[PDB]
Amino acid sequence: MSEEQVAQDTEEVFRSYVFYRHQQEQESTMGQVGRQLAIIGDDINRRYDSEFQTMLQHLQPTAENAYEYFTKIATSLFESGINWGRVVALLGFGYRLALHVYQHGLTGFLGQVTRFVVDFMLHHSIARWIAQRGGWVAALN
Amino acid sequence: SMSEEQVAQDTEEVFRSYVFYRHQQEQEAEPSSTMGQVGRQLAIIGDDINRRYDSEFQTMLQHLQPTAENAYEYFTKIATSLFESGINWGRVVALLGFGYRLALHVYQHGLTGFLGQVTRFVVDFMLHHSIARWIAQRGGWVAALN
């Protein structure tokens, strides 16, 4: 098989892995590969997952911090070489990191959308238009 | 005295109240600040023009399926194009409605809106660190199996 075809397959493998690990924690060919790898992380990947959940608990990541943190953890994991255990561990790390940038990303999203609106309105003279009308109370009449 | 800056501070309060009351209006029906009452009343007063914008925003977001990554770029292009033909009271209120739907879209989708970033981190790392070539030699992702 080719290097490029594995990269395309990885997207499918990971997305299936994430979905199935999430539902496993709660109480199509490459999809099955990801489906079979998610259930595996109950005995062997138990230590990797326990190590990943600990380091992300102290060092809380955001959608802007996520890259640096992913890279430094991933780089050091493959520093001593590549093996099947570390490859599957990178899928486990990706899952745990996604959970963290969703937890923080969820609770702060309205704040992102709030600034988008405020800024657009200020920068596009909409705020000055409203100010002439007599402010936001002029919308009521 | 009314200033452009004053309106920007007021907008934060208007929008946050609008979002909250628009969500309640949607869940229930199938000491708040002065600007909180403005945002609350705007969400309540639903006329043909505003229902028409919400139906258009619903359709845009259901098709374009914005993620938390392309949320800024999507907001900007929709907003910019909405004010392209000029400013009026109908479009100003519509921008509050768009903001609500854009927040609601991503909240309702969950992990799906945030995993795209992490997905490309994994793929890229593996490709650029020869992990993808290592797997390719083994015979692809099926070689990981028992």
Shortest distance between the Cα of B146 and any Cα of chain A, in A, equals 10
Looking at domain B1-146, its CATH superfamily turns out to be Blc2-like (1.10.437.10)
Q: Are the Cβ atoms of B114 and A33 closer than 8 angstroms?
A: no
Percent of chain B as helix, strand, coil, to the nearest 5: 80, 0, 20
Domain boundaries, chain B: 1-146
Q: Does A124 belong to an annotated binding site?
A: no
**The residue to which tokens 């255990």 are assigned:** A85
Tell whether B20 is within 8 A of chain A (Cβ): no
Tokens found for residue B45: 């007063």
Residue B78: name the closest of B105, B117, B110 by CA.
B105
Distance from the A21 Cα atom to the nearest Cα atom in chain B, whole angstroms: 13
Cβ <8 Å between B121 and A94: yes
The reply to whether A40 touches chain B by the CB within 8 Å rule is no
Separation in Å, CA B140 to CA A66, A85, A87, A93, B113: 28, 15, 12, 20, 28
How was it solved? Answer: X-ray
Please choose, from the candidates A40, A35, A34, A37, the residue with its C-alpha nearest in 3D space to the C-alpha of residue A9. A34
Residue A9: left if φ>0, alpha if ψ -120 to 50, beta else—which one?
alpha
B123 contacts A11? CB cut-off 8 A = yes
Find chain A residues with C-beta within 8 A of B129's C-beta: 74, 78
How many CA atoms are closer than 13 Å to the CA of B74, on its beta-carbon side? 22
Helices (H), chain A: 3-25, 29-40, 46-58, 66-77, 84-107, 109-123, 126-133
Architecture of the domain whose range is A1-141: Orthogonal Bundle (1.10)
Which of chain B's residues have a Cβ under 8 Å away from the Cβ of A15? 115, 119
